[PDB]
């Protein structure tokens, strides 16, 4: 199934966990968009003062994604494959706006989305659409037509502090292998070479100057009141 | 000011700090305006 | 006893001793690679007050192998490991079929086992000051 | 100190900060914008929190709604 | 009256030792400024990256009879 | 009637439930535009604190829609089907800006539009307009001119109530399949699995934990103030 | 602010409303200072 | 205002005045609504 070409899927859900799909939600296009673009931006602080020549620039945050792609709709009858509509393309751009747009009053907002296609898996909502209507028939039905996306970011609040496995809070052991000293190793561990004392009076060391290259210790968090 | 006592809070708006440092200036010129008026 | 926040319990298929009076149990790694078994090997809605634990692996039966699928089993599985097994860090997932004929997926999974304390390992003298969230 | 800087255990890169109620910390899904604290002579010292909730979609307020900072 | 003879604030980045009742040393703003201040008053302020303090030095001369109100039914 | 070219039609209205015409009141264009283009805006709230790798997004609101189009007028005497006026383009374009334009003393208002064409159906108000006229006869009379347009969305409030059909609140009933407990059902319908006690009493049941595949349950709203 | 005392009335410029949101917020920021320094 | 008591000296930024009939519109109406709160 190497030889298949894939085509690209937007699946509506109900939930921020993605596990209860809307029924009838699930859009299928006909022709591949040509590139897609990704965007991304951190932003730091950036304050000094006056006389100095250079400042530490800060972390501040990393700021939410995005995607674009363009979307084409053609029923004219050049395409291998598929069969001229008596309606053309009425029934796929409204299919589309169902999925996408519409406003759910189960869950008082528009749908949860997911977009695969090949390697690609994104989650997120719409923000921006734009259609442009380019054939008619004699009678006012249209057969071809573009359209223009944008998607952002959306990530569920116990799921980014299990991604930021955030960790002088927790517990912490190693193995003392050959070439350690206990005041470097705490320096490795908490920042500062000073706390050895305490390290030591955890683990039972007496002879702390000389350790054994089999020892494991373990170097407790330091308290918060 | 030479006094803490008349710094607030400051808040940001993710709309996307230039709209901060406007009403922080609009605060000082009242809070001068009203001291003034005190004098004999 | 340096590793004792990876913690001791039951063993999964518990057994039960006659030799002395007692069931079995696991401890360290063993508790880890047991905790996996049962995570993946029970439905989303089969625990009665917790009715979003374990996998949905079951969703692929009976379809095709390509690019796509291999790419919905790879986030199928990290996510059920990010919420609940605290222990560790998936290092490689490999997706592979051996078989021309016989209906047969194969799956490995590789990973690398916490040497800090995570904030959400329910260990009884550990939770109680470091289990935030 | 002549060195021409403010003294700091630490580079001033990362700011970190923990807030406990009761003895406990915060549960980390709760985010704080920003934070004040002030003193002063003669006067009684004070300190304020902001932190984001609400939401138009599920009607509701869940921080405000939990035990952590409730008065008292 | 004489500890309100030099009044003023000063902002830096922030340590957390700066409490009212302190002393610290004042350089470079002229010789009508220079010299040693006492801490009257600190603003602790931590947001969008940074943790910065404003450090109030001299004294209000005016008394709490003065200028509070509602002491009295 | 499929051989029929149809044109383009804007009819003024003087209620907002559109069932009540201006007299005179109602425009036929003699050429088609070429194209037309619709506007989608969906708006979010984006506040994240500083420190995080990502913002806790929030549904706001989905923003008025748009339509744009272009028209030609040209009585020259070159276009199959029509004939040459004494006085140019003079009375198209001034029955044209009396239907879209012109302030109504009856309403204290300009009209409610409806613009039909093929597929297309929309209601709404006129932003914008712009005429630039091209040609000439020798004592002033124009013969062509150019008009662009934009036209907002107009819903009545009542009818936005009705298309947002918002559903906790209200009461609901499910039939039992095989395969159905009900802490699992009470956490579909509420978000919660713990009000199971609760949908047990309304129903009247004892052997909670066995039901029977054919019984229909009620699941009564949960109580404000 | 919580009391309709401190409303202002609302008189724009056709000079051709953003204008109007940044002088409301001006005012909010005033009338908080002010009563936070009569506390004790 | 109808009155000289309420009025701030102008200092502008060479940063290259428009700032300025900003600040002063914010002063005229905190101004405006610390009278009226005496009223009856």
Redesign the interface.
């Given at each position: 199934?190497?030889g298949?070409l894939?085509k690209l899927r937007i699946v509506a859900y109900k939930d921020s966990?993605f596990?209860?799909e809307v029924e009838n939600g699930e859009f299928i296009t006909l022709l591949n968009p040509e590139k897609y673009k990704f965007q991304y931006r951190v932003?730091?602080?950036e304050?000094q003062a006056s006389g100095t020549s250079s400042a530490?620039?800060?972390?501040?945050?990393?700021?939410?994604q995005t995607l674009e792609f363009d979307f084409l709709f053609d029923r004219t009858g050049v395409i291998a494959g598929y069969e001229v509509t008596e309606?053309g393309i009425?029934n796929d751009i409204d299919h589309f706006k169902k999925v996408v747009?519409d406003?759910n009053?189960?869950?008082?907002?528009?749908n949860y989305l997911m977009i695969?296609?090949?390697?690609?898996?994104f989650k997120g909502?719409?923000?921006?659409?734009?259609?442009?209507?380019?054939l008619?028939?004699?009678?006012?039905?249209?057969i071809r037509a573009m359209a223009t996306t944008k998607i952002?970011?959306?990530?569920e609040?116990?799921?980014?502090?299990?991604?930021?496995?955030?960790?002088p809070?927790?517990?912490?052991?190693?193995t003392v292998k050959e070439g350690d000293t206990l005041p470097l190793m705490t320096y490795r561990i908490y920042?500062?070479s000073k706390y050895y004392l305490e390290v030591a009076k955890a683990n039972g060391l007496t002879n702390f100057r000389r350790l054994k290259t089999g020892t494991?210790?373990?170097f407790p968090?330091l308290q918060?009141? | 000011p030479i006094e803490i006592k008349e710094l607030h809070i400051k808040i940001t708006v993710d709309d996307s700090e230039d709209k901060q440092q406007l009403v922080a200036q609009c605060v000082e010129q009242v809070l001068d305006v009203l001291k003034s008026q005190k004098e004999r | 006893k340096s590793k004792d926040f990876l913690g001791t319990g039951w063993g999964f298929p518990p057994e039960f001793e006659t030799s002395i009076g007692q069931v079995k149990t696991t401890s360290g790694v063993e508790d880890i690679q047991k905790s996996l078994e049962i995570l993946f090997s029970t439905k989303i809605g089969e625990r009665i007050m917790q009715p979003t634990y374990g996998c949905n692996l079951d969703e692929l039966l009976f379809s095709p192998i390509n690019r796509t699928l291999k790419t919905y089993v790879i986030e199928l599985i990290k996510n059920a490991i990010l919420y609940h097994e605290p222990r560790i860090d998936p290092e490689k997932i490999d997706i592979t079929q051996g078989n021309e004929i016989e209906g047969e997926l194969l799956i490995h999974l590789q990973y690398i086992v916490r040497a800090t304390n995570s904030r959400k390992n329910m260990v009884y003298p550990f939770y109680l000051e470091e289990g935030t969230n | 100190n002549n060195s021409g800087t403010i003294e700091t255990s630490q580079s001033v890169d990362r700011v970190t900060h923990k807030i406990l109620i009761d003895g406990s910390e915060i549960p980390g899904t709760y985010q704080v914008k920003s934070i004040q604290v002030t003193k002063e002579v003669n006067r009684i010292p004070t300190a304020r929190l902001v932190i984001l909730d609400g939401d138009a979609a599920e009607r509701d307020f869940k921080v405000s709604n939990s035990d952590h900072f409730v008065p008292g | 009256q004489q500890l309100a003879k030099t009044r003023g604030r000063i902002k830096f980045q922030g340590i957390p030792t700066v409490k009212p009742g302190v002393n610290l040393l004042l350089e470079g703003v002229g010789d009508r400024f220079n010299g040693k201040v006492f801490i009257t008053g600190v603003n602790h302020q931590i947001s969008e990256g940074n943790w910065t303090v404003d450090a109030q030095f001299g004294l209000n001369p005016e008394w709490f009879s003065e200028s509070e109100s509602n002491i009295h039914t």
């Open positions: 199934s190497e298949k894939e966990k596990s209860d932003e730091q602080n304050d530490p620039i800060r972390f501040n945050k990393i700021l939410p309606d009425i747009y406003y009053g189960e869950k008082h907002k528009p695969t296609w090949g390697s690609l898996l909502y719409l923000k921006e659409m734009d259609i442009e209507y380019k008619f028939r004699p009678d006012g039905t249209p952002g970011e959306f990530v609040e116990e799921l980014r502090t299990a991604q930021e496995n955030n960790q809070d927790m517990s912490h052991y190693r920042g500062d494991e210790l373990i968090p918060k009141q | - | - | - | -």
